[PDB]
Amino acid sequence: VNKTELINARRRLDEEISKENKTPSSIRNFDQAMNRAQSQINTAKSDADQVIGTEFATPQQVNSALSKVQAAQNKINEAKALLQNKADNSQLVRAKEQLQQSIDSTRNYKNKRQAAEQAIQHANSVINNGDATSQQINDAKNTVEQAQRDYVEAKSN
């Protein structure tokens, strides 16, 4: 039997869904939907892994596992659809700075320094977790990069 489509669909279940530049509320919604779907996803992953590892798998077993994987992928895509892009505030930042010059930054700096320290602690926890998923690693990377961007901006005004 040709397992190509099942293998490819099974691998797609593990792909990172990017949270880069997504709103914090929409990320919460995504994580909440993924948790609701998690047992269905895990069962699809497990059944597909068994078929993939079956040396003499049948087309029926491949097709049944593929159907489960496709339904699990639809659940992931439903969760992904909750993610929303942040809106760009760069022109508002520049306008605010121009108004300030025409006429609390320390607290804001300290808040963003703390956010950077928390991002480093979160990254270390993920790095040290041998069970970490591609999604968890990528989420932590995006959090680190956002904390760096926010820190530089807060120390620069």
Numbering used by the authors: 6 to 108, 120 to 173
Which sentences did the original study use to describe this structure?
Extracellular matrix binding protein (Embp) and its subdomains referred to as the F-repeat and the FG-repeat are critical for adherence of S. epidermidis to surface-immobilized Fn. Embp is a giant 1-MDa surface protein consisting of 10,203 amino acids (aa). High-resolution structure analysis of F- and FG-repeats revealed that both repeats are composed of two tightly connected triple α-helix bundles, exhibiting an elongated but rather rigid structural organization in solution. Both F- and FG-repeat possess Fn-binding capacity via interactions with type III subdomain FN12, involving residues within the C and F β-sheet.
A high-resolution crystal structure was obtained for the first F-repeat (corresponding to aa 2569 to 2738 of the full-length Embp). The F-repeat consists of two three-helix bundles and reveals an elongated shape approximately 70 Å in length and 30 Å in width and height. The N-terminal bundle is referred to as F-3H-N, and the C-terminal bundle as F-3H-C. Within F-3H-N, the first helix α1 (aa 2571 to 2584) and the second helix α2 (aa 2599 to 2623) are connected by an extended loop (aa 2585 to 2598). This loop (referred to as the Sandwich-loop [S-loop]) is involved in several stabilizing hydrogen bonds and van der Waals interactions between F-3H-N, a linear linker L2 and F-3H-C, potentially important for the structural integrity of the F-repeat as a compact unit. The analysis of the F-repeat surface characteristics reveals a prominent deep major groove as key structural feature. The wide groove shows an area of approximately 1,200 Å2 comprising a volume of 890 Å3 and is flanked by helix α2 (from F-3H-N) and helices α4, α5, and α6 (from F-3H-C). Compared to the FG-repeat, the crystal structure of the F-repeat reveals some similarities but also significant differences. Most importantly, the F-repeat misses a common long central helix, being relevant for structural integrity of the FG-repeat. Within the F-repeat, however, cohesion between α-helical bundles is supported by a so-called Sandwich-loop, a structural feature not described before. Based on the high-resolution structure, it appears that the F-repeat part of Embp is likely to be less tight and rigid than the FG-repeat containing region.
